[model samples]
Target: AAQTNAPWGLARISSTSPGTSTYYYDESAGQGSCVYVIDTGIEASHPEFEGRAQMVKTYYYSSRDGNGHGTHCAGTVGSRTYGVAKKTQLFGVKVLDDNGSGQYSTIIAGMDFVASDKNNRNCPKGVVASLSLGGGYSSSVNSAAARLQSSGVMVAVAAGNNNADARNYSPASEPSVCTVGASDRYDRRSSFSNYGSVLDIFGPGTSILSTWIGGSTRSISGTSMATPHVAGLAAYLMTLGKTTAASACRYIADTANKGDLSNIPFGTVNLLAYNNYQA
Candidate 1:
């Protein structure tokens, strides 16, 4: 079957109460740009991915997906209906199979595909790489990530579901990599998200809405879900260009709202600190 194993997408949830999805297409119409979701295949058939979805390429490095995780991740970055970058183009680089697993070589190969902009037609230049998978940080992946980043590629990775320490992963914990932790609408980090100085920022990753493969609706949670929100934010910030990842992160972190939030660590993340913090 096509890639399944949903890992939860980064639906654009508000940082305030209700934590519902937000819609300001006019506010930040995410056009004239694109990103690469290097994970399981995307559910392009989903209503949320119908009119606004564009695919530059599709690849399965080792195997496909069955758990519906990768698709969920991609939808978070650029689903057609209620995603962050509705107008952005997507390139699905499937690495694992239905069992939700793959070899490291295969995963790195997928990264290479996007980072190198192979064939020039498959993945256009100036594309950001959104990686939602994680294992203990690896020198191999770290080296690869450094190469990609040095080339001006924005590589984002999940901080892993282990709430203990987010620095356990390779690409996510790497220096140049953009590490995303999980946070709720209350601006508090999710209990499952790895937290530390290395962890770049947090995004809405709890009870997010996205595709579930064949005409299915799925509700997922975890750092996996939070990774894409930052991916979208990256896309939006790219549109603005004046905002650096540091400033963009500060904006989301500081602007977050607190008070009356469910089991939040703190209240109100300051997301506006970088409103004009140019890159």
Candidate 2:
């Protein structure tokens, strides 16, 4: 069952052990949860979405993914074929541009909208926010992300790909959000992934395959790819009853697979994500 792009990350997180290269998960684990991707927008009509993903908002002038970054993250978060929580709803909130970049004002605007949506929703399921992008230190951006989490939206952000201390980055360094670093299939931190005490967990981000632009999939690698894995898992946990943002975050951190990763540099935690899919 191993295709060229095997999507091994799925099995890696679901397995009782690491590196199984086979995924066996509860198909309905996230049926009641939803994820909002704060990045470049998505190609909502892509078949990979299976009608479960859509573009609901935009910032800095557009709601389409000119760079496919947000689409990829959305796929990782909840696409039926590529997501951690296959049944969860996926929403795309465009903030970044065609170049996979955005400024603090734009990013904050995008996050603020999600905050508003979460606060206003009377829905039963939990709403999670996956932020697979970031910049250097910015107080305003940090505050915005924190505000979203406090509004009951579990925020999972990338720890940046600079290979520097994650404490130096915005959103990631924000204390209230889940900051994720990149780990490989072999259980080593990705060579280019950021580290340090601020990171909350690790996720497979090396040569990972997911839904992409033009209704296809690609094997891209970065901390950006890792963050959504955690977000989807948090949503799954929320669906299973950890309704509040803090509770879901705590559940993820508490249940994560620990000490499996071989590298422990830069004072980062060894917690890698798991879907809790029992055999």
Give each model's clash number: 33, 0
Error of 1 at 173 (Å): 1.1
lDDT of 2 at 197: 90
lDDT of 2 at 173: 95
Model 2 segments beyond 4 Å from truth?
1-6, 119-123
lDDT of 2 by residue, 1-279 (tens): 222233878878776466575666665557778899998899888887889888888875767798989889988887876888877888889889889888799999889899887655533678899999999989999999999988878899999999999989999999889999998888989998999999888999888788898898898999999999899888877776754667776677788898888766847898888866664
Worst 10 residues of 1 by lDDT: 270-279
Best by TM-score: 2
lDDT string for model 1 (196-239, tens) is 65666666666777667775757787777777777666666666
RMSD of each: 6.3, 2.2
Our model 2 lands, by Cα RMSD against the true structure, at 2.2
Q: Ten-residue segment with the worst summed lDDT in candidate 2?
A: 1-10
